[PDB]
Every structure is written in structure tokens, then in C-alpha cells.
Symmetry: C2
């Protein structure tokens, strides 16, 4: 289920911060935040907290398939408790901060960062706020 999507045709990578605040209703479900590139809606970065297993799965969906999963055991989420996820990209990585602490970085596989124009948030997250802000200046 699509919960939120933003489109910024000039490109939201690198140099933009994305802050998502909300909470997850179920202790067994999951949500994802995807950064998509044009053309073809390829997933440059897929950030997928899985509450049933208490893992964050990250990957990219390029050339119509997933690549190698990067699985992180740092899981700063609890069902029904508000959280804040901040994502920023520089020339080389996506950086994830959760409740103000650094969690992981994900190295770019899609190098056409400026073609990343869409932010998509799916599944079990009740969104209270999305903020997208230019920082690379």
C-alpha cells in the first residue's frame, strides 16, 4: 500500500535530506522508503525495516531485479512508538540516522544520482510528517 510519494524532477540526490516521522501499527509488519530514478522507476535505494525479524534490509532494484541485500541488525524501532528516520545522500552513500543516531550507510549502486526524482513510502507506517530539504550548498 502506497502511503506517500514525492516527485522532484530536478533531482533530490545528492544533497537533500529526507526526514520521515511516524509509527508502525503492528509488531509483525514492515514498511519501506524507496528512492526511485527516471526513467523506468528503478529503485536506487530501498530501506526496509522488518519488525517481525527486527532487521533493516537495504537493496536496489536495478535492471529489473534486486541486487545483494545489505542487512543491518541495528533496529531502533518499536511497534506503535513514534520514530524519526533521516536520510541524506552525498556523492558516495545514502546515510541513515534514526532518532538522531547514525545507523548505517549504503553505497550508491545507481550512479546517476540526479535522476533520483521520486521518494516513495509503502506499507505499515502511519506518517506524521515528511520533510525534504536541500542541504548540499
Amino acid at each position: 500500500a502506497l502511503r506517500f510519494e514525492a516527485l522532484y524532477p530536478e533531482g533530490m540526490c545528492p544533497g537533500w535530506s529526507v526526514v520521515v516521522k511516524g509509527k508502525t501499527s503492528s509488531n509483525t509488519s514492515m514498511f519501506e522508503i524507496n528512492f526511485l530514478s527516471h526513467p523506468g522507476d528503478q529503485i536506487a535505494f530501498h530501506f526496509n525495516p522488518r519488525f517481525a525479524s527486527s532487521r533493516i534490509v537495504c537493496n536496489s532494484f536495478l535492471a529489473n531485479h534486486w541486487g545483494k541485500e545489505e542487512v543491518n541488525k541495528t533496529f531502533p524501532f518499536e511497534a506503535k512508538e513514534p520514530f524519526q528516520v533521516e536520510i541524506y545522500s552525498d556523492q558516495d552513500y545514502f546515510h541513515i540516522f534514526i532518532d538522531e543516531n547514525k545507523i548505517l550507510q549504503y553505497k550508491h549502486r545507481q550512479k546517476q544520482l540526479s535522476s533520483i526524482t521520486k521518494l516513495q513510502i509503502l506499507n505499515d507506517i502511519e506518517i506524521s510528517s515528511v520533510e525534504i530539504t536541500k542541504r548540499g550548498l
Copy 2:
């Protein structure tokens, strides 16, 4: 051209704030912020600062035509300089602020507030931030 669009299928009206920061590139063009209703991306609320004449036009496209234009008495914007515009909706109005100071209110003409699922930003605005936030105690 389209500068930004956001979609929240659960309906971003009423009880949501939208905060847009940016500046114009030209001294004499215009930009607009539209709230769009589902289905059909219909223009429930159109907010159009026009820098050539220094007028803000607000309107809706309903029943197949643009309604009566509401032209604001003042124009607090300056071209080529950062600004912060906030739009908040309750049961009766869109409320518009600049630098957190209320500019105008626009009475809802589209009554299907829950069907307003898209925020669209067009034309001469170099966006630096968009924030869309649910009001906690509505």
C-alpha cells in the same frame, strides 16, 4: 513546469500543514501551489503569487470552469529572495502564512476535503524545502 508534487492517498486535508521554502528565479514571473483532488487531479485550491503585477490570485477549478478569482489586497513577497509559505487547512478554510504571519484565508469550495491527496508546485520557484505535517490535535 512541474517543480514538485506530493501524493498522500489517505487525504492531506483537513488538518495538515504544508510548508514551502524557496525563492523565485525571475523578478516578473509567477509560481503556484495547487491542492488536487482524487480522482482526476482536480484543482480544489490554486494559490498563485504573480510577481509582474504583485498580485496573489486564489481560485478553484470546479464544475468544469475556474470560479471567481479572489485577488488578495496585499502582496508581501519579494522576488529572488528566500521565503517560507505555510498552508494549513481546517473544516472551513485554507489558511496561508508567510514568515508565520497570516496573509489570507480561502473558504473551501471543494467540500470533499478527504479527496485532496496531492500537493503540486509549478513554475518560477526554486524550492529549498517542502514539509508536509499532520496536525496532532485536530
